[PDB]
Design an enzyme around this catalytic site. Sequence first.
Site, PDB file in Angstrom:
ATOM      1  N   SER A 186       0.847  -1.191   0.000  1.00  0.00           N
ATOM      2  CA  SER A 186       0.000   0.000   0.000  1.00  0.00           C
ATOM      3  C   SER A 186       0.888   1.250   0.000  1.00  0.00           C
ATOM      4  CB  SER A 186      -0.894   0.060   1.225  1.00  0.00           C
ATOM      5  OG  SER A 186      -1.539   1.337   1.214  1.00  0.00           O
ATOM      6  N   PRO A 187       0.626   2.201  -0.903  1.00  0.00           N
ATOM      7  CA  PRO A 187       1.416   3.431  -0.868  1.00  0.00           C
ATOM      8  C   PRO A 187       0.882   4.467   0.145  1.00  0.00           C
ATOM      9  CG  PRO A 187      -0.021   3.437  -2.793  1.00  0.00           C
ATOM     10  CD  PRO A 187      -0.299   2.149  -2.061  1.00  0.00           C
ATOM     11  N   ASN A 188      -0.182   4.109   0.882  1.00  0.00           N
ATOM     12  CA  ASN A 188      -0.949   5.066   1.714  1.00  0.00           C
ATOM     13  C   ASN A 188      -0.809   4.899   3.233  1.00  0.00           C
ATOM     14  OD1 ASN A 188      -1.896   6.198  -0.746  1.00  0.00           O
ATOM     15  ND2 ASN A 188      -3.383   4.516  -0.893  1.00  0.00           N
ATOM     16  N   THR A 189       0.136   4.067   3.646  1.00  0.00           N
ATOM     17  CA  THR A 189       0.481   3.895   5.071  1.00  0.00           C
ATOM     18  C   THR A 189       2.000   4.117   5.177  1.00  0.00           C
ATOM     19  OG1 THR A 189      -1.374   2.382   5.582  1.00  0.00           O
ATOM     20  CG2 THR A 189       0.602   2.216   7.035  1.00  0.00           C
ATOM     21  N   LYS A 226       1.784  -9.412  -1.664  1.00  0.00           N
ATOM     22  CA  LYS A 226       1.385  -8.468  -2.679  1.00  0.00           C
ATOM     23  C   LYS A 226       2.413  -7.357  -2.748  1.00  0.00           C
ATOM     24  CE  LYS A 226      -2.463  -5.769  -4.548  1.00  0.00           C
ATOM     25  NZ  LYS A 226      -3.954  -5.646  -4.459  1.00  0.00           N
ATOM     26  N   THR A 254       0.280  -6.361  -9.409  1.00  0.00           N
ATOM     27  CA  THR A 254       0.877  -5.454  -8.439  1.00  0.00           C
ATOM     28  C   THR A 254      -0.196  -4.626  -7.751  1.00  0.00           C
ATOM     29  OG1 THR A 254       0.905  -3.554  -9.997  1.00  0.00           O
ATOM     30  CG2 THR A 254       2.906  -4.935  -9.964  1.00  0.00           C
TER      31      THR A 254
HETATM   32  C1  LIG Z   1     -10.097   2.475  -4.312  1.00  0.00           C
HETATM   33  C2  LIG Z   1      -9.058   1.366  -4.183  1.00  0.00           C
HETATM   34  C3  LIG Z   1      -8.820   0.737  -2.959  1.00  0.00           C
HETATM   35  C4  LIG Z   1      -7.859  -0.275  -2.870  1.00  0.00           C
HETATM   36  N1  LIG Z   1      -7.600  -0.922  -1.698  1.00  0.00           N
HETATM   37  C5  LIG Z   1      -6.694  -1.943  -1.624  1.00  0.00           C
HETATM   38  C6  LIG Z   1      -6.455  -2.658  -0.367  1.00  0.00           C
HETATM   39  O1  LIG Z   1      -7.105  -2.317   0.690  1.00  0.00           O
HETATM   40  N2  LIG Z   1      -5.521  -3.640  -0.379  1.00  0.00           N
HETATM   41  C7  LIG Z   1      -4.823  -3.993  -1.485  1.00  0.00           C
HETATM   42  O2  LIG Z   1      -3.977  -4.914  -1.398  1.00  0.00           O
HETATM   43  N3  LIG Z   1      -4.984  -3.375  -2.688  1.00  0.00           N
HETATM   44  C8  LIG Z   1      -5.886  -2.371  -2.802  1.00  0.00           C
HETATM   45  N4  LIG Z   1      -6.139  -1.739  -4.022  1.00  0.00           N
HETATM   46  C9  LIG Z   1      -5.372  -2.122  -5.200  1.00  0.00           C
HETATM   47  C10 LIG Z   1      -6.091  -3.120  -6.080  1.00  0.00           C
HETATM   48  O3  LIG Z   1      -6.267  -4.295  -5.281  1.00  0.00           O
HETATM   49  C11 LIG Z   1      -5.216  -3.415  -7.315  1.00  0.00           C
HETATM   50  O4  LIG Z   1      -3.943  -3.941  -6.827  1.00  0.00           O
HETATM   51  C12 LIG Z   1      -4.925  -2.119  -8.127  1.00  0.00           C
HETATM   52  O5  LIG Z   1      -6.017  -1.169  -8.058  1.00  0.00           O
HETATM   53  C13 LIG Z   1      -4.624  -2.420  -9.597  1.00  0.00           C
HETATM   54  O6  LIG Z   1      -5.754  -3.025 -10.218  1.00  0.00           O
HETATM   55  P1  LIG Z   1      -6.854  -2.238 -11.109  1.00  0.00           P
HETATM   56  O7  LIG Z   1      -6.055  -1.370 -12.066  1.00  0.00           O
HETATM   57  O8  LIG Z   1      -7.594  -3.333 -11.810  1.00  0.00           O
HETATM   58  O9  LIG Z   1      -7.680  -1.460 -10.120  1.00  0.00           O
HETATM   59  C14 LIG Z   1      -7.120  -0.698  -4.092  1.00  0.00           C
HETATM   60  C15 LIG Z   1      -7.372  -0.057  -5.291  1.00  0.00           C
HETATM   61  C16 LIG Z   1      -8.310   0.936  -5.392  1.00  0.00           C
HETATM   62  C17 LIG Z   1      -8.539   1.565  -6.741  1.00  0.00           C
HETATM   63  O1  LIG Z   2      -6.349   1.575   1.743  1.00  0.00           O
HETATM   64  C1  LIG Z   2      -5.633   2.029   0.848  1.00  0.00           C
HETATM   65  O2  LIG Z   2      -5.262   3.237   0.834  1.00  0.00           O
HETATM   66  C2  LIG Z   2      -4.981   1.209  -0.223  1.00  0.00           C
HETATM   67  C3  LIG Z   2      -4.303   0.031   0.101  1.00  0.00           C
HETATM   68  C4  LIG Z   2      -3.607  -0.624  -0.942  1.00  0.00           C
HETATM   69  O3  LIG Z   2      -3.009  -1.710  -0.734  1.00  0.00           O
HETATM   70  N1  LIG Z   2      -3.579  -0.081  -2.177  1.00  0.00           N
HETATM   71  C5  LIG Z   2      -4.202   1.098  -2.445  1.00  0.00           C
HETATM   72  O4  LIG Z   2      -4.139   1.574  -3.609  1.00  0.00           O
HETATM   73  N2  LIG Z   2      -4.899   1.742  -1.480  1.00  0.00           N
END
Ligand SMILES: Cc1cc2nc3c(=O)[nH]c(=O)nc-3n(C[C@H](O)[C@H](O)[C@H](O)COP(=O)(O)O)c2cc1C
Ligand SMILES: O=C(O)c1cc(=O)[nH]c(=O)[nH]1
Length: 367
Positions: A186-189, A226, A254
């Site tokens: 996660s880039p947000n922690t 992940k 990813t």
């Molecule tokens: C709004 C949002 C919330 C996300 N939350 C998580 C998360 O809690 N944990 C995680 O491992 N990835 C999270 N992701 C990443 C997705 O699981 C995925 O790795 C990433 O968005 C790339 O796929 P996509 O282009 O099909 O969305 C999140 C993505 C989005 C857009």
């Molecule tokens: O909760 C989130 O900010 C979040 C987690 C994560 O793994 N990836 C992401 O894009 N957002």
Amino acid sequence: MATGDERFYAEHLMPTLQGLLDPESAHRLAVRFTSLGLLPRARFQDSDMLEVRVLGHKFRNPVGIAAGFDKHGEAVDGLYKMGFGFVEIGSVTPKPQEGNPRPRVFRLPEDQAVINRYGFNSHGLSVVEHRLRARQQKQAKLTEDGLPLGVNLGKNKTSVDAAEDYAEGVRVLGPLADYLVVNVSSPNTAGLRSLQGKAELRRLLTKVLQERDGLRRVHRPAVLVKIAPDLTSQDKEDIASVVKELGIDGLIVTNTTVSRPAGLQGALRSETGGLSGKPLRDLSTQTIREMYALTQGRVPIIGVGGVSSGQDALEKIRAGASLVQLYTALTFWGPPVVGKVKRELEALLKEQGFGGVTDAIGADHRR
Ligand SMILES: Cc1cc2nc3c(=O)[nH]c(=O)nc-3n(C[C@H](O)[C@H](O)[C@H](O)COP(=O)(O)O)c2cc1C
Ligand SMILES: O=C(O)c1cc(=O)[nH]c(=O)[nH]1
Ligand SMILES: CC(=C/CC/C(C)=C\Cc1c(O)c(Cl)c(C)c(C=O)c1O)/C=C/C(=O)C(C)(C)O
């Protein structure tokens, strides 16, 4: 009632409803509607060509919903109804937490991309545990029927010991999961991505695997890590080395990118957060390709990032993914994107001479 055309959702329904609601409210409504089953039951019937056996399980089709859509395990059954071959919930943190202040999610429609900085808003392990226990036997039958469940683990903002956070997730949710994901990307922690470093990763995963191996056999999940799309070549080599040393069961490749590819047009391109969707697509595919070669094709990969078509899915599969996930495409195309990806993937497998998805996994490496 709302059923159920590709062009209708893409051209008319989704752009209209996006014009009416901010992205977080739109997400909440999507979760609500999905959980109540207020969607068409997907009309596409999965062919045998789409079946994949990996991670100690049968997957009826290789198209899953990525983590972040159903963070709290509220819509699992509605997601299988939408046609996903597997569901991943989370990320879930040990204690409940609110996540970052609003606004924290942004659409970039000109890029078919999203930027988010949610920061692991989570109902917490206890709430998700009870939610999953209430349908545990139903999930056991779904899994047997080729529809496995993954659970993605995060860590609380203010925790001192990251490894104890993930360990607690393994103990609490491990017995309810077909696979667990250690989300270190996660880039947000703050500081989280540093857990991808060789020494930190080795220590964290040793502990995770010790905890997992202590679970009863029938409740013992596969463990996946992940990873970010923004790693150096050195970071990638180090991850591959740790994965093989420890016998990690697989990789999810990813998460979102903190890069901002040249060419982004969306007004909101300079918001802080992880970028998902189409601008992430080839960066993710190239990371799969690398990780597959570094692990000698011996470590299952779930490929994710910008998948919105059968071609997108097949490129990741040929690059080395055994399974794929999507999230962001749903926000632009709606539920019909799931049958679309599956139908196009089947046609392309036939066109390219593959017997099934299994024959295509890693095919680019054998050229
Ligand atoms: C709004 C949002 C919330 C996300 N939350 C998580 C998360 O809690 N944990 C995680 O491992 N990835 C999270 N992701 C990443 C997705 O699981 C995925 O790795 C990433 O968005 C790339 O796929 P996509 O282009 O099909 O969305 C999140 C993505 C989005 C857009
Ligand atoms: O909760 C989130 O900010 C979040 C987690 C994560 O793994 N990836 C992401 O894009 N957002
Ligand atoms: C009636 C209905 C409205 C969808 C909500 C809208 C207007 C956009 C969806 C949307 C979004 O616009 C945005 Cl930005 C996000 C982040 C999500 C995440 O779930 C999202 O679902 C049904 C939506 C769905 O079934 C899905 C496709 C799951 O969102």
